[PDB]
Every structure is written in C-alpha cells, then in structure tokens.
Amino acid sequence: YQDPERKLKILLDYSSKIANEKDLRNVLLFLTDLAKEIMEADRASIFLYDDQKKTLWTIVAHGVDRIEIDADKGIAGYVFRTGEILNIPDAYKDPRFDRDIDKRTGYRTRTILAVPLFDRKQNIIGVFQVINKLTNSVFTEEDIELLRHISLYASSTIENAILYEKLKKAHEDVIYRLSHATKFKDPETQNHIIRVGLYAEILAREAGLDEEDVELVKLAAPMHDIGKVGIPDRVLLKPGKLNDEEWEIMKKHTIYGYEILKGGDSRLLQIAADIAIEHHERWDGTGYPFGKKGEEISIYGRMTSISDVFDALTSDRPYKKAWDMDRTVRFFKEQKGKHFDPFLTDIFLKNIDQMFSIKRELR
Amino acid sequence: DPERKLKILLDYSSKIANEKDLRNVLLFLTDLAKEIMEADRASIFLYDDQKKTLWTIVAHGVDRIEIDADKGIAGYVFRTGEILNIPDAYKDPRFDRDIDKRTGYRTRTILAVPLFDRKQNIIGVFQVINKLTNSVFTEEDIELLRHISLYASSTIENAILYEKLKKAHEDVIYRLSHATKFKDPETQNHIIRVGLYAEILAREAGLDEEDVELVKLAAPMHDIGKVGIPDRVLLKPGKLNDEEWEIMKKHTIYGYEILKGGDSRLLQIAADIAIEHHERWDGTGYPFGKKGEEISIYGRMTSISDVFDALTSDRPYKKAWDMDRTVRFFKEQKGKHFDPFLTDIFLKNIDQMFSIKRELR
Numbered sequence: 001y002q003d004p005e006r007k008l009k010i011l012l013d014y015s016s017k018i019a020n021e022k023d024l025r026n027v028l029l030f031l032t033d034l035a036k037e038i039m040e041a042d043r044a045s046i047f048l049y050d051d052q053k054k055t056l057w058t059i060v061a062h063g064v065d066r067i068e069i070d071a072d073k074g075i076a077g078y079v080f081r082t083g084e085i086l087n088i089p090d091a092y093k094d095p096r097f098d099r100d101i102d103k104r105t106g107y108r109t110r111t112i113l114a115v116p117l118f119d120r121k122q123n124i125i126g127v128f129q130v131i132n133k134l135t136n137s138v139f140t141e142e143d144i145e146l147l148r149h150i151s152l153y154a155s156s157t158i159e160n161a162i163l164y165e166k167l168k169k170a171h172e173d174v175i176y177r178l179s180h181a182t183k184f185k186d187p188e189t190q191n192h193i194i195r196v197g198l199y200a201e202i203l204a205r206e207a208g209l210d211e212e213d214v215e216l217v218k219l220a221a222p223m224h225d226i227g228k229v230g231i232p233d234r235v236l237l238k239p240g241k242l243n244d245e246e247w248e249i250m251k252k253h254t255i256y257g258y259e260i261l262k263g264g265d266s267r268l269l270q271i272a273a274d275i276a277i278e279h280h281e282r283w284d285g286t287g288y289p290f291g292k293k294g295e296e297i298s299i300y301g302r303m304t305s306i307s308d309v310f311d312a313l314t315s316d317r318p319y320k321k322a323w324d325m326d327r328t329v330r331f332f333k334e335q336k337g338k339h340f341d342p343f344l345t346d347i348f349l350k351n352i353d354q355m356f357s358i359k360r361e362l363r
Numbered sequence: 364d365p366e367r368k369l370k371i372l373l374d375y376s377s378k379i380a381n382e383k384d385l386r387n388v389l390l391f392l393t394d395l396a397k398e399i400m401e402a403d404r405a406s407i408f409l410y411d412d413q414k415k416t417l418w419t420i421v422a423h424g425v426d427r428i429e430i431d432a433d434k435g436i437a438g439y440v441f442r443t444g445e446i447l448n449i450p451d452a453y454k455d456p457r458f459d460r461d462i463d464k465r466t467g468y469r470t471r472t473i474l475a476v477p478l479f480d481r482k483q484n485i486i487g488v489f490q491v492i493n494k495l496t497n498s499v500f501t502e503e504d505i506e507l508l509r510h511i512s513l514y515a516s517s518t519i520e521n522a523i524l525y526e527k528l529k530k531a532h533e534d535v536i537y538r539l540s541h542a543t544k545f546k547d548p549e550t551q552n553h554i555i556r557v558g559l560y561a562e563i564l565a566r567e568a569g570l571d572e573e574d575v576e577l578v579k580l581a582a583p584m585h586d587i588g589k590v591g592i593p594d595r596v597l598l599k600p601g602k603l604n605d606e607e608w609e610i611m612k613k614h615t616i617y618g619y620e621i622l623k624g625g626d627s628r629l630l631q632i633a634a635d636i637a638i639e640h641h642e643r644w645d646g647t648g649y650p651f652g653k654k655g656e657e658i659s660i661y662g663r664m665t666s667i668s669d670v671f672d673a674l675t676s677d678r679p680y681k682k683a684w685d686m687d688r689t690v691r692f693f694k695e696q697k698g699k700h701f702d703p704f705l706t707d708i709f710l711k712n713i714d715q716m717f718s719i720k721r722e723l724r
C-alpha cells in the first residue's frame with residue numbers, strides 16, 4: 001500500500017539539507033533534485049543572471065563549470081525577458097527550441113515547463129525549468145501552480161545563500177583592513193595579517209577542532225598585534241635595537257590588545273583577546289608578558305605563536321633574508337617543546353607545504 | 364490535493380529562508396506545524412545553557428517564557444529524549460493544567476518530540492496540541508513530526524548561526540573602531556551612537572533596508588585614520604599650530620587608505636564616510652572642499668550625526684545643549700555645514716536622537 005504524505009516528507013527532507021548548505025553550487029543542485037521529484041519530471045535546470053557578463057548561466061552536471069546561456073533566445077530566455085510562463089506541450093512543434101543537445105546524446109525532449117524567479121523586489125532574476133513530465137503527457141494547470149511555489153522557495157534560498165556569503169566576506173574584509181590600521185607606523189604588510197590566520201586555520205583544522213573554532217582562529221588570529229596602536233611613536237618607529245625601557249613598553253602590546261578586545265560578548269572576540277595577550281607566551285614558560293607555561297596558554301594562543309613566528313622567519317626583515325623550508329623545518333624541529341607546543345609543532349611540520357604555498361601565493 | 368500541503372510548506376519555507384529574526388522563525392515553524400499536522404496549537408521549546416531552563420515564545424513576540432526544564436511534558440522529552448504521545452492530557456499526572464485555566468483552552472491531545480543539533484544533543488522540544496480530529500496522534504502523525512522536527516532543527520541552527528555572525532560582525536567594528544582609545548578621548552559609546560543616529564536618519568530618508576544596516580555599521584569607523592597621526596600632534600599638550608592642524612586634517616585621507624579597496628559594499632561606504640565626514644555642504648570643509656552632492660549621502664548623514672553627538676555631550680565648563688538649543692543650531696547650519704533636505708528629516712526625528720543619547724549614556 002501507498003503513503004499519503006510521501007512527497008511532503010521528501011520535501012521536508014530536501015528542505016533540511018538546503019537549509020544547512022552554505023554553498024550556492026549545492027543549493028542549486030538540491031533545488032533541481034527536489035523539483036525533479038516533486039514535479040515528477042525527468043530533468044530540471046535553474047538559470048541565474050550575471051550583471052557583468054550580461055548572460056544567464058546554469059550548471060549541467062554535479063561538479064562541473066558554468067554554461068553560458070543566451071538571455072535573448074530559447075525558452076528560458078523568453079521567460080526571463082517577458083516574465084511569463086511557458087508550457088510547451090511538444091517541444092518539436094516549437095521554433096524557440098534548439099534540438100542540439102538532443103541531436104547528440106540519446107535524448108528526446110517532449111514537454112517543457114518554465115517559470116521566472118523573482119527577487120524580494122519583483123525583478124526577474126532567472127528561470128526555473130522542468131523537462132519531460134513522467135506520470136502524464138503534459139504539464140498541467142496544477143503543475144504550473146506547484147512550480148510557481150517551488151520558484152518562490154528557490155528564490156528565497158538562493159538569495160539567502162548569496163546574502164550570507166556577502167556578510168561572511170564583509171566580516172573578513174573588516175577584520176583584515178581594520179587589523180591593519182597600525183600600517184602607517186609599522187612595516188607589516190596587509191598579507192602578513194591575513195596569512196597568520198590562514199596558517200592557524202590549517203593547524204586548528206588538523207588538531208581536530210570543531211569546524212566553528214576553525215573559522216574562529218582563521219579570523220581571530222589576524223588581530224593579534226592590534227595593541228600596537230597603544231605604543232608610543234618614539235618606540236614603535238625606532239629602527240634597530242631597543243633599550244630595556246623601550247622593550248618593556250613594546251612588550252605591552254599584548255596587554256593593550258587584550259584591553260581593546262576583551263569587551264565584546266561574541267566568541268570571536270573572547271578568542272581574539274586571548275590570542276592578543278598570549279601569542280608571545282612560550283611553552284617553556286619563559287615568554288612574555290606573564291611567563292605562562294604549557295596548558296596555561298589557550299590553544300588559540302599556541303596556534304598563533306607558531307603561525308606568527310613562521311610568517312616572520314619566511315619574510316625578509318632588516319639584515320636577514322627569509323628562511324627556506326629546510327632551515328625553518330630545522331628551527332621548528334629545534335624549538336619543539338620549547339618555544340612551541342610539541343603536538344602542534346608536529347602538525348605544523350606534517351603540513352609545511354601548505355604553509356609555504358600560502359606564503360608563495362600571497363606576496 | 365494533496366499538493367495542498369506541499370504548497371503550504373513551500374510558502375512557509377520561503378518565509379523562513381528570509382527571516383533573520385529567531386523569534387519569527389519559531390513563529391513560522393509553529394504555524395507550519397499547525398497546518399501540516401492539522402492541529403490546533405504548537406510550541407517550540409529551546410534550552411538556555413545559562414538560566415538552565417527551556418523557554419518558548421507566544422504569538423506577538425512578547426518576552427520569552429521560562430519553562431521548568433525538569434518536570435512537565437516538555438521537560439520529560441527534553442531530559443529523556445523519548446517521544447510523548449498523550450491521548451488525554453487531563454488523565455496525565457505530568458500535565459500542568461494552568462495554561463488551560465488562564466486562557467480558557469482545553470488541552471486534549473499532546474504529542475512532543477525532541478529536537479537535535481548536528482552533534483546529536485537534545486536542544487529542545489517540538490510539541491503539537493489538539494489534533495483537529497479530536498482523536499489521537501497516530502504513528503503516521505508521529506512520523507510526520509519527526510520529519511518536521513528535523514526541518515526545525517535545521518532552520519533554527521541556521522538562524523542562530525546567522526545571529527552569531529551578525530553580533531560578532533558588530534562587536535568587531537565597534538571594538539576595533541575604539542582602537543584609538545589609548546591616544547584619544549572619544550568613547551566606545553560615542554562610536555556606536557553615531558551609527559545609531561545615522562541609521563534612523565537613513566531609514567527616514569528613504570534608503571533600502573540593506574543600506575540602512577550599512578550606514579549603521581560604516582559610520583562608526585569614520586575616525587579610524589587617527590591611528591596614522593604622529594604623536595607629536597595627536598598627543599601635543601597645547602593647542603595646535605597651522606602646520607600641526609594640516610596633519611590632523613589628514614586622518615580623513617588616512618581613513619580612506621585604511622578602508623578602501625575592500626571589495627565589499629560595507630568598506631566602500633566606510634572609506635567614503637571616512638574621507639568625507641569633515642566636508643561641508645557649501646564646499647568650505649576639508650580635505651577637498653567637496654560641495655553639495657559631490658559629498659556622498661552616507662557622508663552627509665554622518666556629518667550630521669557626529670555634530671549631534673558632540674553638542675549633546677557635557678565637557679567641563681560646557682554643558683550639553685538641550686533640545687531647543689540644538690534645533691536652533693541645525694536650522695542655522697542648514698545649507699552651510701549640512702544638507703538641507705537631510706537636516707529637515709533629522710529635525711523631524713530629533714526626539715529619537717535624544718532617546719538614543721539617553722539610553723546609551
């Protein structure tokens with residue numbers, strides 16, 4: 001016997017999957033799979049618009065690249081420009097149809113149903129299309145209603161996926177650019193700030209931290225030197241060696257960083273604050289400001305020592321050319337259990353090629 | 364038919380994919396449960412790690428209600444993880460009949476299932492009450508609810524995630540804009556409020572809700588370039604001379620440099636506000652002397668909100684201006700310092716400005 005709620009459940013299930021997916025590629029996939037099943041159609045395609053290349057595009061197979069689709073021709077095109085539904089009972093009795101996919105693969109297209117996709121403000125942003133109804137000879141009035149409702153969901157989840165990406169990207173740009181405010185009074189390039197996070201990301205990832213803490217270090221670590229805004233010019237700008245009144249001030253950037261950052265309530269800023277105050281501590285317990293020992297340093301500080309030191313050693317600094325892999329490996333191998341967490345050092349060594357490819361690919 | 368319930372679910376799921384407020388998401392979910400399960404009421408309960416209780420919202424988004432996490436029906440499902448199907452609430456020892464006693468409701472059937480996070484901890488309870496047949500929840504019913512509960516977990520977890528991202532994005536803009544705090548008197552709250560004023564201004568000025576959110580978060584970075592000013596100036600204990608003043612002016616350029624080139628919209632606007640906020644509508648400002656609509660609108664809104672905040676803050680020997688005093692000032696500055704069309708809008712809403720200034724002291 002049959003299940004009355006069968007499709008309802010399928011649809012709940014797709015809706016859970018799509019709600020967890022942050023990747024537009026997979027959202028488009030799951031959407032088309034969903035439509036094929038609920039519409040009982042052999043195929044489906046979502047078409048979206050590109051402002052800059054001025055065309056529609058679509059992904060044909062799982063995991064292969066955009067296909068450009070001419071905004072002005074074909075069925076999709078017509079729907080896109082006019083705003084209205086096309087229901088082709090037979091595709092071959094229709095001039096707007098290009099039999100060319102059809103020529104080559106062993107496939108005959110019979111029925112086509114295509115509706116527009118609207119953004120929140122009623123602009124047509126693309127087309128949703130299904131092909132070859134399986135449990136009937138044509139697409140019905142109800143099929144149209146159904147797809148109109150699907151197009152509504154496709155739109156919402158598509159936009160929401162894009163908007164989460166924009167906000168994620170902005171949040172990064174803001175940490176990067178503001179973290180580099182010290183730049184008028186410190187040689188450190190933009191990319192130093194970025195790269196330190198990228199290394200610490202790999203580390204946290206491979207030490208097996210939760211996926212969220214991985215994204216956290218990636219973004220907390222770059223703020224490690226923010227305290228430098230609180231250092232006197234006479235000290236921050238002085239080239240070469242520092243006396244022992246000046247160094248004592250320069251060390252204080254760890255405490256300043258804490259001050260700047262500890263005030264938030266977000267986890268990002270609790271982590272960033274800890275990193276700022278900790279990343280010059282040392283596993284031995286010798287490093288400043290407090291001489292914290294082993295596990296007394298948070299793991300996020302520990303990951304940041306390693307990353308901070310790596311990035312410095314592999315850049316030209318006054319009188320020292322950047323270290324190659326071989327020396328850097330020798331150095332970490334030496335400092336294992338000394339400057340650094342021994343466990344994290346191993347992980348770092350396992351992953352050293354990636355560190356260097358980050359370093360090479362970000363000038 | 365039976366495409367009716369799919370069309371309903373797509374409808375609710377469209378609303379939910381857009382909704383960025385948790386409380387609204389819980390409302391939509393419980394209305395979906397009601398239509399999909401053909402039942403009269405539905406509640407969602409979430410756990411607070413902090414207060415160590417469950418909570419729920421009722422319709423109208425009034426203050427959330429504490430529910431005892433240990434006892435009760437949601438308490439049982441929460442603690443044990445088992446499903447509860449009651450055929451008659453009033454024959455059950457675990458039911459609390461006071462919600463009935465106050466509302467005048469009569470609870471008959473209750474079905475409650477747990478909600479799970481990805482790591483598979485119980486994070487709350489989904490509860491459906493009074494199936495519209497007047498008879499029991501069936502196994503096919505329980506089964507539909509396990510699936511609904513799965514969608515609710517997802518949309519919830521997603522929405523709590525989005526909120527963490529929002530809240531941290533703000534904290535970072537605020538805390539890092541106040542990075543000048545070791546070398547400059549401007550307060551954390553000054554920085555926030557300037558964006559709050561700009562927000563209200565942008566909204567009432569007609570801008571899209573996305574641009575309103577932007578100015579709320581861009582304007583607080585207007586003074587970032589102060590970081591680049593030499594101590595021999597920013598920290599000079601005197602008044603400055605003209606050579607030193609010219610270097611001060613540069614924090615506008617320094618800001619633009621720090622912020623620009625960012626690919627995203629937020630930073631384009633911030634970089635513009637930073638270079639523009641000391642320009643004046645009549646072209647007598649600095650650093651470039653831009654006139655009228657050559658100053659971007661986000662700049663124009665910030666000039667206004669920044670001056671507003673200054674005039675209304677006490678400094679020694681100089682009490683803050685009150686409402687009347689301040690309004691006179693903006694009227695006198697219309698078309699000079701400030702964009703006239705925008706001052707008017709600002710004036711229509713000046714009570715809101717003082718409210719902000721009053722609560723975020």
Ligand SMILES: Nc1nc2c(ncn2[C@@H]2O[C@@H]3COP(=O)(O)O[C@H]4[C@@H](O)[C@H](n5cnc6c(=O)[nH]c(N)nc65)O[C@@H]4COP(=O)(O)O[C@H]3[C@H]2O)c(=O)[nH]1
Pocket residue numbers: 237238239240241242250280308309312313317320
């Ligand atoms: N063993 C070894 N470790 C290295 C070397 N170069 C960098 N590091 C490591 O990298 C950390 C941060 O270095 P940085 O990026 O140059 O960032 C430095 C740098 O900007 C500044 N600094 C350190 N020494 C001097 C100095 O003599 N003059 C000036 N102007 N600044 C200095 O203070 C920051 C913190 O430095 P540290 O507390 O020493 O902590 C250092 C140190 O452990 C090296 O050649 N050998």
Ligand SMILES: [Fe+3]
Pocket residue numbers: 224225253279280
């Ligand atoms: Fe440091």
Ligand SMILES: [Fe+3]
Pocket residue numbers: 586
């Ligand atoms: Fe200022």
Ligand SMILES: [Fe+3]
Pocket residue numbers: 585586614640641
């Ligand atoms: Fe300024």
Ligand SMILES: [Fe+3]
Pocket residue numbers: 549586669
């Ligand atoms: Fe200001």
